[PDB]
Amino acid sequence: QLSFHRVDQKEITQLSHLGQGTRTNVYEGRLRQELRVVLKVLDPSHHDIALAFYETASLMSQVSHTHLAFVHGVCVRGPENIMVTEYVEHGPLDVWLRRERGHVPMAWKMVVAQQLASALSYLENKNLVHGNVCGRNILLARLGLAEGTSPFIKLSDPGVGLGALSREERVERIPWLAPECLPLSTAMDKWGFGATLLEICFDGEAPLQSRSPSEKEHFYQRQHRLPEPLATLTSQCLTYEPTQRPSFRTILRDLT
Numbered sequence: 744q745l746s747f748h749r750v751d752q753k754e755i756t757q758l759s760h761l762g763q764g765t766r767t768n769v770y771e772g773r774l775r776q777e778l779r780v781v782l783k784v785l786d787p788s789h790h791d792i793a794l795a796f797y798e799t800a801s802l803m804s805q806v807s808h809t810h811l812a813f814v815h816g817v818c819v820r821g822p823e824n825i826m827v828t829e830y831v832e833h834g835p836l837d838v839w840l841r842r843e844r845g846h847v848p849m850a851w852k853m854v855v856a857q858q859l860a861s862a863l864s865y866l867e868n869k870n871l872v873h874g875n876v877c878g879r880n881i882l883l884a885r886l887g888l889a890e891g892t893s894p895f896i897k898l899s900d901p902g903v904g905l906g907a908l909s910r911e912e913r914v915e916r917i918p919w920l921a922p923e924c925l926p927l928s929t930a931m932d933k934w935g936f937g938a939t940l941l942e943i944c945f946d947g948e949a950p951l952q953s954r955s956p957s958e959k960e961h962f963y964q965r966q967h968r969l970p971e972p973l974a975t976l977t978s979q980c981l982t983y984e985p986t987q988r989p990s991f992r993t994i995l996r997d998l999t
C-alpha cells in the first residue's frame with residue numbers, strides 16, 4: 744500500500760551538499776513559489792534498498808505531527824531516487840550540541856526530550872516504528888537559547904528502512920540500535936529514545952561511539968548496562984528486554 748507524492752524532476756533544483764545519510768547524500772534544494780527543501784539522493788542501490796527507502800517515504804507521507812519533519816514526496820531523476828523532505832533551519836542536533844558544548848542548559852535539553860517524546864507518543868499510538876531515533880535525525884527548527892525563547896525540533900524521516908540494512912550498518916548504529924535488532928516493534932524506539940537522551944545529556948557525544956565494531960558488538964553480547972546521564976528514565980528505556988521498556992505515555996508524563 745505504498746502512498747506518496749511523485750515529484751517530477753522538473754520541479755527540483757539541487758544546491759549545496761549537506762552530508763551523508765545511510766546510503767544517501769543530503770543537499771539543500773528547491774521545490775517549485777519555490778520552497779527551500781532537502782533532497783536525499785539514494786546511492787546506486789539494489790531494488791531491496793530502494794523498496795526500504797520508498798517504504799520510509801510512504802510511512803512519513805501518511806503521518807502528521809508538529810515534531811515530525813514533512814516529506815514532500817519522491818523524485819526519480821534519471822537513475823537516482825530522491826526523497827524531498829523538510830529543510831530544517833539549524834540542521835541536525837548531534838552536530839549542533841558538539842559545536843555548542845558546555846553552554847546548552849539542561850532545561851533546554853528537557854524541552855527537546857519532551858518534544859521528541861511527544862513525536863514518539865504519536866507514533867506509538869499509531870503503532871508505527873521510526874527505527875532510527877538519534878541526535879542526527881533530530882533537526883533544530885528554532886534555537887531557543889535567547890532569554891524568553893524555547894527550542895523546537897523535527898524528527899527526520901528514518902531514511903532507508905532498518906530492515907534492509909547490513910549487519911555492519913546495524914553495528915554502526917549502536918547504541919541507538921535496540922539490541923533485539925542486531926541479529927520490528929515500537930519497543931525499539933524506546934531504546935533509541937533512551938540512547939538519544941544520553942547523547943543529548945552528553946552534548947552530542949553518544950556512549951560507545953569511539954569504540955570499534957567488535958567492541959560495540961561485544962558490549963551488546965555481554966548485555967552490558969549503558970551509562971547513567973533522566974537516569975531512572977534512560978535505565979528503563981535502555982532495558983535489554985523490550986517488553987520492560989516504559990510506554991511513551993509514561994515517558995511523557997515522567998518528563999513533565
Ligand SMILES: CNc1cc(Nc2cccnc2OC)nc2c(C(=O)NC3CC3)cnn12
Pocket residue numbers: 761762763764769781812828829830831832833834835838879880882899900
Ligand atoms: C540545515 N538544514 C539541514 C542540514 C542537514 N545537514 C546534514 C545532513 C546529513 C548529514 N549531516 C548534516 O549536517 C552535518 N540536514 C538536514 C535535514 C535532514 O533531514 N537531514 C538528514 C539527516 C536527516 C533537514 N534539514 N537539514
